[PDB]
Write a protein that binds this ligand. Sequence first.
Ligand SMILES: Nc1nc2c(ncn2[C@@H]2O[C@H](COP(=O)(O)OP(=O)(O)CP(=O)(O)O)[C@@H](O)[C@H]2O)c(=O)[nH]1
Ligand SMILES: [Mg+2]
Ligand code: NA
Length: 414
Amino acid sequence: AWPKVQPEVNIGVVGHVDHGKTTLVQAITGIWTSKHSEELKRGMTIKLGYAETNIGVCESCKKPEAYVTEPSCKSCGSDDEPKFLRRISFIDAPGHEVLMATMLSGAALMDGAILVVAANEPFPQPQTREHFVALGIIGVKNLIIVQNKVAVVSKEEALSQYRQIKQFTKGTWAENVPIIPVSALHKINIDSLIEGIEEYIKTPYRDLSQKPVMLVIRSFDVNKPGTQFNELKGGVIGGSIIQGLFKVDQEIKVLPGLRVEKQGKVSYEPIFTKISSIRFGDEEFKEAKPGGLVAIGTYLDPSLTKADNLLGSIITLADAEVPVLWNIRIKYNLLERVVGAKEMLKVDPIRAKETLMLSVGSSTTLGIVTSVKKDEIEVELRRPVAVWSNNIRTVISRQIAGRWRMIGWGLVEI
Ligand SMILES: Nc1nc2c(ncn2[C@@H]2O[C@H](COP(=O)(O)OP(=O)(O)CP(=O)(O)O)[C@@H](O)[C@H]2O)c(=O)[nH]1
Ligand SMILES: [Mg+2]
Ligand code: NA
C-alpha cells in the first residue's frame, strides 16, 4: 500500500483571472479549493486555495499515461500496485488584479509553479505578465507553463499561441520552460502535466538543521457553534514551513503577535503558545517539514485565531531571536513598466513620503518612504513585520488608478 506522508513540495498555480487555475487543481487532485461562501457565491478564488495528491508511476506501462494520482495501474492493464513517488500539494492563487497581493503572499510558500494560460484568450494578459514577473522576482523558477482550455481551439490556434509564449519567454530566465497543453475542465492530456511536474518541479533539498520558520496564511476556530466551553478546542494556525521543522509539544511564538490597544495607543506583542497538534489535510503527524500546508493546533483562545486574524504572521520556536520592525531598509530595484496594468505605463522613481505596499513573506503592509537613494529606500510601516533572516525578498507595489500594482522588488536589510 501507499504510505501516508505529508506533501514534500508546494506547487503554485497562477495566471490571469478565469484562465482555469482552480479547475486545473481539481483535474489533478479531485478537489475544489474554494471553501469560503463568498468565493462559491461570486465564482472566484479569493483566499489562497489548497489541495493535495499522491503521485505514483506504473513501472511496466508507457509514459506519460503510466503516471497516476492514485494507487492503481488498471488503466494500463496491470493489477500491480504503482510505485509511490511522492505527495505534492498546490497553492492555488487568485487571478483577479485587485487580489495581486494575495498572489504575492502565496508566492512565498511556493517551491515551484504552474502558470496557467488560457488558449482561447489573447496572450499575454495583464496578470499572466504580473504573475510571471512576480515568480521570477521571488525566485520561484521551477516553472511549467500550461496552455489550458485547448479543447475549445484548433491545434493550429494552440500552436500560434505556443509560438507567442516562446517569443515572450525568450531572453528571460524562463526561455526553456516547458509548455504543456491541457483541458482542465474535460480532463485532457493531464498525464503529460503530471509527467512534466515530475520532470521539472523536483522536491528541493531541505536543510532541516536550520531554525524552524513558518509563514502564516490562515488561522481559525474549529469549534462548532454552541460548543460547551469546557470542550472548546484551542485556536488553529495554518501556513507553510519554509525552513527547519516543527514538532508536537514545542514551545512556539507568533510574530509580530497580537495588536494591543492602550488608550488609543497601539503596539504588538508576541503570542507565546505550545503546539498541541500537527495536521496536513486529513492526516495527523508528530512533526511538520517544508512542503504542504500545515495546521498547527495550539492552546490559544480560539477568539485569537478566528477568521484568519493572524494572516501574515510568522511562527518560530519561543527562544528564537527575530527582529520585529516598524521601519525597514530595502535594497531595491524597479521594473521599467507596470506589467500588471491594462495600458502600458512607465514606473516612476520612488518619491519621498510616498505610500507603498510591501510584501514580505506572507505579510502585506503599507508604509511611508522616509528616505530615497539609488539602490536603497527606508520605509516607516503602519504595522510591524517579522524579519527572520537577512536578505529576505520583498515585493514593492504602488497604488495606480486606485489599484495596487507591482512596480519592483528588493532585499530587506537588517
Ligand atoms: N472550456 C474550458 N473552460 C474552463 C477550463 N478550465 C476552467 N474553465 C472555466 O473557466 C471558468 C473559471 O474557471 P476557474 O478554474 O475558476 O478559473 P480561475 O482561474 O481559478 C478563476 P480565479 O482567477 O478568480 O481564481 C469556469 O467557468 C470554468 O468552467 C477548461 O479547461 N476548458
Ligand atoms: Mg481560482
Ligand atoms: Na520558495
